[PDB]
Structures are given as structure tokens and as C-alpha cells.
Amino acid sequence: EKVEEWIKARGLTWRLLIMQKPTRTVAEAAALLGVSESEIVKTLIVLDNAGGVYAVVIPGDKRLNINSMKELAGKPVRLARANEVVELTGYPVGGVPPVALPPNIVLVVDRILLSRKKVYGGGGRENALLEFSPRELVEATGAVVADVSE
Numbered sequence: 607e608k609v610e611e612w613i614k615a616r617g618l619t620w621r622l623l624i625m626q627k628p629t630r631t632v633a634e635a636a637a638l639l640g641v642s643e644s645e646i647v648k649t650l651i652v653l654d655n656a657g658g659v660y661a662v663v664i665p666g667d668k669r670l671n672i673n674s675m676k677e678l679a680g681k682p683v684r685l686a687r688a689n690e691v692v693e694l695t696g697y698p699v700g701g702v703p704p705v706a707l708p709p710n711i712v713l714v715v716d717r718i719l720l721s722r723k724k725v726y727g728g729g730g731r732e733n734a735l736l737e738f739s740p741r742e743l744v745e746a747t748g749a750v751v752a753d754v755s756e
Contacts, residue, residue, distance in 0.1 A: 609730040612706040616746055620738040628700060628732035632666035635735065639726055643667035646735075647719060647727045649702040651686035651694060651711075654679045659686070659694055662714045663704050663727065663743075668755035678714065678752050702728040703736055704743055713749040715740060720751065 613620045629635040635646045646666035652675050653659055660679070662670060675683045688699050695707050704713060704727050719725060719740040729736040744751060 607730075608706040609703045609734075609736060618738075618742060618746070620736060620742075622729045623726065623735045623737055625733045625735065630700075635726065636666065639735070641726070644718075645722060645725050647704075647725045647740075649704045649728050651691045651702065652679075652683050653686050653690070654681040654683045656681055658712070659710060660712045660714055661695075661702070661704060661707055662716070662754055663719065663740075664716045664755040665718055668716075668718075671754050671756040674752065674754045674756075675714075678750065678754065697728065697730055698732050700728070700732045701730055701734060703730045704728070704738075705736075705747065706730070713743075713747050714754060715744055715749045715751050716755045717751045717753060718755065720744070 632643050632646050636643045643666040647663050650662045650670055652662050691699055695702055725740055726735040726737055
């Protein structure tokens, strides 16, 4: 609901696609949509050691470059554990969206995604994928573009 309401409020053309059964891996999501893993993006929650929380969107075929986030944050960082992801965002582990998150969370988008017109991220539920444009996401949120994947 929150993700759909967010899209409508910004007047964007993004859509929620529904998987009959939730996917368990990035490979499965890419295959079912007929795209590549790099087009299935994950919203990773990252925590610094002073209460800071970040949502970092990266290609599905990469992993977070921790050192890069430490440099961006300017403080020691780590990945939020699964229970922390749910607690701090209000969304399920496999459905964390890149928008409509609590306002304290800082959004970071990996620049390798910017040339892609369409990607599929967390839709707010384990079985929903958000079809969106990385550039539109950045423009709408003021997100920080960085090199945070490896």
C-alpha cells in the first residue's frame, strides 16, 4: 500500500509486478521476468556505528562493497541483520522497497544502474517487485549516486 501510494503521489509510471510464489533467489526473479540478474536490484540496509541507517540499491549480480560505504558514511558500517531490516524498515526481508521507507533512512544508488532504463526492486511484499527507472528514482529522492558494489 505505501509503495503504491508513493508512486501515485509523485505521478510516476512505476508498477508493481506480482510473483505467484515469492522468489527465493535473484536468479529466480531474473528468469521469471526474462531479464538478467543485474536488472533485479536489491535494497540493502546498512548501519553505521552512530545510529545512521542507509538503504543501498545495487545490481542483483553484485554484493555490497563495505569499504566503499564506510568511506561514503565517513563512519564504520555493517550490513543490518535480517531482523534489523524488518524492524527498521517495516517491510519483509525479501521485499524491501527503495522508496516509502522511514524518513531517517538515507538512500544510496549504485551508479552502474543509471544507464539501465528499467530495473526490478523490492515492491513492499515478498511476492511483489517494483518496476522502476533508476534515474527517476535518483531525481525523485535526491539519492546519493556512488560506487558501492563489487
